[PDB]
């Protein structure tokens, strides 16, 4: 059994919806981080709000599942740095349900902390952003933008995730990248010739390549064979069934592969209310209709927004005489999707679209 299936189904549906807002530009997010945060919100939801969140998050034992998956993601390894941490910041004068606070700590280890939103909201925002910055080793410095919290803010539920790994085999830093039918942009390429898992997903007309990090985390890249990015078919037809078949432990066949991928860095910020609403999570965001009585007996809360910020920096860092070129090539000189997979849990930690150097 794939123990991360709900989260993966959500990750893919979320990507499809986000792509409606952003169909062609670079995209990057951590579906894991979002699922975790939303799970903590779900714990406080009731009535129709709850029923819709369960549908959207693909839950149709959830909390014990997150705790177990989180434990596996956080396991000490020696091979890379990988940390996922949740946090709850609550208005100091507010009275939340004792069982909500207890259960959120039990299953999410969110170390519930009081802050002063009512009178010092800007100070509270700075503190929250500083906490995330620390957790992300400086990589996500200002998660919550100006105006995101105010005197009516009652609780901010946070997840931070951080990953730093080295490739099992280092690349060599070696050029035109095809952005669309009217644009080519020079990019620094990285080259590797190594025994790697490579296949082809006919239903998506795309090559898939696995690049392992040291340890049980890998990057999978999906590269299509339109006059825009070339990703229309792949993005519209990708599903859990089609993808999981190919990311599964032993489907693919290892071969000597010559790989060229760009060296790249992405940094993207999102506000997900519109997206989550479109996916079916309406009542949570409806000031009138939301039911978060699980958080507060007074039933006086609603979800105002969900902020997400994610970054990635891909480089050559890892742990002669060959001249033939008869075998597989994977030349990522045009737009591709990629994902960073925790192999033990089968959870997607990060997912993106690289289309514009």
């Amino acid at each position: 059994e794939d123990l991360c299936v709900a989260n993966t189904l959500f990750a893919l549906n979320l990507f499809k919806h986000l792509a409606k807002a952003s169909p062609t530009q670079n995209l990057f997010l951590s579906p894991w981080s979002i699922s975790s945060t939303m799970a903590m919100v779900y714990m406080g939801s009731r009535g129709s709000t709850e029923d819709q969140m369960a549908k959207v998050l693909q839950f149709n034992k959830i909390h014990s599942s997150f705790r177990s998956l989180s434990s596996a993601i956080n396991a000490s390894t020696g091979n890379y740095l990988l940390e996922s941490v949740n946090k709850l910041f609550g208005e100091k004068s507010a009275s939340f349900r004792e069982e909500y606070i207890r259960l959120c700590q039990k299953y999410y280890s969110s170390e519930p902390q009081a802050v002063d939103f009512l009178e010092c909201a800007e100070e509270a925002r700075k503190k929250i952003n500083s906490w995330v910055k620390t957790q992300t080793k400086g990589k996500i410095p200002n998660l919550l933008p100006e105006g995101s919290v105010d005197g009516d803010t009652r609780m901010v539920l946070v997840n931070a995730v951080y990953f730093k790994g080295k490739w099992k085999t280092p690349f060599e830093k070696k050029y035109p990248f095809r952005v669309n039918s009217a644009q080519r942009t020079p990019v620094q390429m990285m080259y590797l010739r190594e025994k790697l898992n490579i296949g082809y997903i006919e239903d998506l007309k795309a090559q898939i390549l696995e690049l392992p990090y040291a340890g049980d985390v890998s990057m999978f890249l999906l590269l299509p064979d339109d006059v825009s990015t070339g990703l229309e078919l792949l993005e519209s037809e990708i599903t859990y069934d089609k993808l999981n078949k190919w990311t599964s432990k032993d489907k693919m066949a290892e071969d000597e592969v010559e790989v060229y991928i760009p060296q790249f860095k992405l940094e993207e910020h999102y506000e997900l209310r519109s997206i989550l609403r479109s996916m079916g999570m309406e009542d949570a965001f409806n000031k009138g209709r939301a039911n978060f009585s699980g958080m507060s007996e007074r039933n006086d809360l609603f979800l105002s927004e969900v902020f997400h910020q994610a970054m990635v920096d891909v480089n050559e860092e890892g742990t002669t005489g060959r001249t033939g070129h008869g075998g597989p090539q994977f030349v990522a000189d045009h737009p591709f999707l990629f994902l960073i997979m925790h192999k033990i849990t089968n959870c997607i930690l990060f997912f993106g679209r690289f289309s514009s150097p």
């Binding site: 997010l29 951590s30 981080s33 979002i34 975790s36 945060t37 939303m38 903590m40 919100v41 406080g44 929250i128 995330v132 957790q135 992300t136 080793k137 990589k139 996500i140 998660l143 919550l144 995101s148 919290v149 009516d152 803010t153 009652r154 609780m155 901010v156 539920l157 946070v158 997840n159 931070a160 995730v161 951080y162 990953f163 730093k164 490739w167 990090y213 990057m219 000031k287 939301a290 978060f292 958080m295 006086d300 809360l301 609603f302 979800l303 105002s304 927004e305 969900v306 902020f307 997400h308 910020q309 994610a310 970054m311 990635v312 920096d313 891909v314 480089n315 960073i340 930690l349 990060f350």
Partner: peptide, 14 residues
Amino acid sequence: TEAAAGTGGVMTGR
């Protein structure tokens, strides 16, 4: 690869 992310869900009073 170095990768990181944050998510923040804001609950507001009404």
